[PDB]
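User: Structure with calcium ion, tokens only please.
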Amino acid sequence: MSMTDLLNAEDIKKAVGAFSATDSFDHKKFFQMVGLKKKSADDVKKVFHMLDKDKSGFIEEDELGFILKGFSPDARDLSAKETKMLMAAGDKDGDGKIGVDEFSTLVAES
Ligand SMILES: [Ca+2]
Ligand SMILES: [Ca+2]
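Assistant:
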């Protein structure tokens, strides 16, 4: 869609920097720095739809290793530790996959 128009490029610029590490994943802080939780639920839809590269409606480990490339360039490959923890923390639901409504509220739980 446009992770720039919908959210804010300036908020994105901080957000990518909050995951720009090996294993130091900080989803609550990312979703606040990117202002995700401060945009609409239907915007949070188009958000997830940019990370879901394959359009299947579910993020799993193949996408989850470089998920940031839906937020923006200079995303990089996340650590194996990060991927492992992100999968387990991100799936609030027991599918082993991140879905939008979880992912939105994931970070309000923090
Ligand atoms: Ca997918
Ligand atoms: Ca789920």
